[PDB]
């Protein structure tokens, strides 16, 4: 399950990163 895990966790972390990026960049607008 080498390849399965590696290039499924790649897009897994894609989703995770976009998730946290938006959840960090919204309260920015709130206090702004």
């Amino acid at each position: 399950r080498k390849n399965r895990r590696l290039k499924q966790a790649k897009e897994e972390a894609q989703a995770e990163i976009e998730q946290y990026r938006l959840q960090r960049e919204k309260e920015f607008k709130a206090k702004e």
């Binding site: 895990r5 946290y20 920015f28």
Partner: peptide, 24 residues
């Protein structure tokens, strides 16, 4: 199998959380 994606998530999560924190 497990370790591969384990440290994969670790590395990419860290190296992107650092960036987004610095930016914001």
């Amino acid at each position: 199998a497990e370790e591969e994606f384990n440290i994969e998530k670790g590395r990419l999560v860290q190296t992107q959380r650092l960036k987004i924190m610095e930016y914001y």
